[PDB]
């Protein structure tokens, strides 16, 4: 044309990659297949599983307790489930058309199609309508993502051996759903189809579900999930092997093996960097073993001139706030200015009810690193706004250097987990101390005061536990 | 006895200044009156009134938005209003009894009655069990908070002419209601009653509603509760006289005459520091015209070795969360620690639904002063999370230092404006500039991306919007 970026892939790293370097002043182009910007995150994954989590969380409260606040009829509610898959689509609809006027007044130029590298500066457009273009460019971005990992002897259907896309769009309430893999995925899918009632099983390989984060943090989830949505937990069990009936699966396991029986099977045990007809072998940018694009420190692949960001890379978590900020620090280097990401402050969260977030370190990395560190917890039994509206489960613990009281991680459990974070995030992006936080004014009554009174047990002693 | 320090008065200033005493070592007492811990925030103020703002918001939402989720039968949810009333004592009752605990556990020892100043160093005490004491001390703190103002020509009688201790304990809702001043008190309390059925108009003598906000939040605010509550505001409306007619109200307003009648009349026109029956008079402890006890930096009074804090004080806000601040912070200088507020930023919460969450300062206050700034807006209806879940209403606004980038003020009114502004606190208290908040990584979704994105529009540009 020629550009001075090709972004390849419309998710929120590459449309946020895309209007910050046109807002830089690069002549931007994004190349998208799908027929809609958003990646996975707004069409099949963030957004469309907040949406149904939010729904059916009205739904259980309704049921389980509207009664205790003096509400009566709680008990007459029913979720029409046809109008709420619709309310999900309007709200998707609402996102995606939304990047593509941000594309349009920040003149992006959108091409629809798979792209393919030809050579490091020329990019193949194979468009939706059949019509096959060539781009010219000066630098590129790779932000193709990720797609579900499948278990290669029950292969997905998406009727009933679903990935993530299937079961945001199931038309009815299973009766039974086994959910295999016990991560983050996992566990909101299955409990938004255990509150309308499916009876949900989680298969977890890992001793625990949600490894990566401390026992007493996936300990007070799974007490909530197994008391309020019924689910059943089956750690420590292989999957070996498994077949699909055509209305619905039987599974094998073993912890001495056992047959599980399922209307739908949600396989949620991963998702693998996905750079399929992108042609990277024909320019020979270099990936690991698991398929990630390698890069360095300024997103550079091996090839001068083409970078990568976002899930598909071999940094960072696959979240899309790490993609998105990746995306604004590439456009940045790109434009020659100093962009960078720090890796070492990314939150974490889980949007069941209770929420977790978390950020930073775990107690587990800290005693594999051998930290010495000093712990602040203070549960919302004791916080004045959970006490006043009765939503009291959950806590949250503050880990210090016992040395300096640098805040090293910071675990959240609670109802409003997610906004919580934020504030825990500037603290470690500013190498805040414990007694920084606590001696702030926070507002009476919020839950943020937990946060407060939990680095005030660090420095010195809360004052409400 | 003797004791090192007396504390008279039991709510946020005086519980707190008393637990963190007894934790510095100091031998402390605490002198309350009412029968119950707390002050006026947990028995008749904060939790109570955060209590049925959140019963009668799940009751709103379940006739007026469940539908749009794919939830029916909302419509048939009924408030049985004596259960919700006992709900809110429950809440309140676990609230009190856990500061009881919390004295016995810090050994601070608690006297029942009313204290007065005999000397300086000497305060007597009128049991609630009709026997007196007299306590010696080495330092007093005065915490003994304020009381509404009552309207000299329609005095409460708590049964048509209520003050917010009344309106919190109507055992039935009312047909009709009046609320004369339209501040945080009066919008909370009118919004309970017209969730459930009441007709509630706010007359508010200055132009607007909350005049200490920024016309552009507290029209976002008033447009939510004119649709949502069907609230009626009559502003720059002055009341000159009425009449209390035993089971109605006739009240006689002008902005021109006119004659309003209703079943209940909330005065909420404000508070007035409270030192009845103190004694201040007989050690000649000094107070400016408004009655509030003067005091310096180091919260002393005139008279040595006699301090004040809360809401008695002729400083900073009369809200919760300063008044424990204050408590800390005298408790610490008395320990002969070096103690301090930072006035300048003590945020204000609106528990409203939507929320309105500030601190710092507000446009009006800039333009006063003639500061030179730069405002960042960014409107939830382009917030990821907000549109997810279909609740868009407001907008993030943070205002910086148009020379240095700091940030003066951030004031945010959507469902959850609460808990985001701690983030914003924090922000504050270290000074931050917009690009420090907008270049940290905020989970998505959530509407914590909205004060990322409002700050990114001050130095760069948002993405979304
Ligand atoms: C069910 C689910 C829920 C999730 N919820 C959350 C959440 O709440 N919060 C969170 O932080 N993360 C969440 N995630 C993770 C989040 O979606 C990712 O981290 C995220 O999308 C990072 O993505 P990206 O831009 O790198 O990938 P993308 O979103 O995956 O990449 C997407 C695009 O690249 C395009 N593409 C690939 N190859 C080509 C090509 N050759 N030519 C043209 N286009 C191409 C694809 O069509 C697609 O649109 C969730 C994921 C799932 C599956
Ligand atoms: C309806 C309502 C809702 C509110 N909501 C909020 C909110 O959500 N957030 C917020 O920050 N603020 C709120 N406030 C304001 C909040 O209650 C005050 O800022 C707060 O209580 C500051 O108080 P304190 O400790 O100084 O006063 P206190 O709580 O008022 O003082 C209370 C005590 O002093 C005792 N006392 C007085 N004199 C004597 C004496 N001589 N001997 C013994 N005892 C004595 C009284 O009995 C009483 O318990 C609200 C107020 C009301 C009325």
């Known amino acids: 044309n020629p550009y001075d970026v090709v972004v390849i892939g419309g998710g929120p790293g590459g449309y946020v990659a895309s209007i910050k370097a046109a807002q830089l002043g690069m002549k931007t182009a994004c190349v998208e297949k799908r027929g809609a910007l958003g990646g996975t995150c707004l069409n099949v994954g963030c957004i469309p ?33 046809a109008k709420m898959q619709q309310q999900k689509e309007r709200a998707v609809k609402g996102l995606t058309g939304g990047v593509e006027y941000l594309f349009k007044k920040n003149k992006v130029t959108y091409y629809k199609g798979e792209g393919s590298f030809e050579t490091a500066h020329s990019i193949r457009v194979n468009g939706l309508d059949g019509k096959q273009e060539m781009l010219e460019t000066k630098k590129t971005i790779i932000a193709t993502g990720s797609e579900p990992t499948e278990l290669p002897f029950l292969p997905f259907d998406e ?33 938004v189809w255990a509150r309308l009632g499916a009876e949900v099983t989680v298969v977890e390989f ?73 042609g990277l072998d024909k320019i020979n940018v270099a990936k690991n073993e698991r398929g990630f694009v390698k890069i360095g420190d300024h997103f550079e692949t091996s090839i001068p001139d083409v970078y990568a960001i976002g899930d598909v890379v071999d940094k960072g978590p696959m979240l899309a706030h790490k993609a998105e900020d990746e995306g604004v620090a590439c456009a940045e280097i790109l434009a020659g200015k100093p962009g960078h990401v720090n890796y070492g402050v990314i939150p974490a969260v889980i949007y069941t009810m209770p929420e977790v977030a978390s950020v930073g370190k775990s107690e587990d990395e ?82 943020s005061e937990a946060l407060k009174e939990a680095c005030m047990a660090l420095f010195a002693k809360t004052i409400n536990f």
Chains 1, 2 share one sequence.
């Open 159 to 191: 009727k009933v051996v679903l990935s993530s896309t299937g079961a945001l769009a199931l038309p009815r309430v299973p009766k039974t759903m086994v959910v295999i893999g016990g991560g983050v995925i996992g566990l909101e899918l299955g409990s």
């Open 366 to 447: 800290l005693k594999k690193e051998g930290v010495a560190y000093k712990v602040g917890k203070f549960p919302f039994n004791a916080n004045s706004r959970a006490k006043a509206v009765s939503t009291e489960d959950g806590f949250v613990k503050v880990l210090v250097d016992k040395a300096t009281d640098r805040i090293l991680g910071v675990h959240i459990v609670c109802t409003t987990a997610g906004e919580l974070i934020g504030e825990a995030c500037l603290a470690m992006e500013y190498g805040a101390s414990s007694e920084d936080v606590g001696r702030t004014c926070h507002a009476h009554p919020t839950m």
């Open 49 to 81: 599983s907040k949406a149904l989590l939010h729904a059916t969380h009205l739904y259980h409260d309704a049921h389980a307790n509207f009664a205790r606040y003096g509400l009566m009829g709680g008990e007459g509610v029913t979720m029409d489930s």
């Open 206 to 278: 890992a001793p625990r579900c949600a490894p990566t984060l401390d026992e007493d943090v996936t300990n007070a989830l799974v007490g909530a999930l197994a008391k309020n949505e019924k689910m059943k937990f089956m750690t420590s069990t292989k999957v070996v092997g498994g077949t699909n009936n055509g209305d619905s699966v039987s599974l094998e396991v073993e912890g001495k093996r056992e047959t599980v029986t399922c209307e739908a099977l949600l396989v949620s045990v991963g998702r693998r960097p996905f750079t399929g007809g992108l």
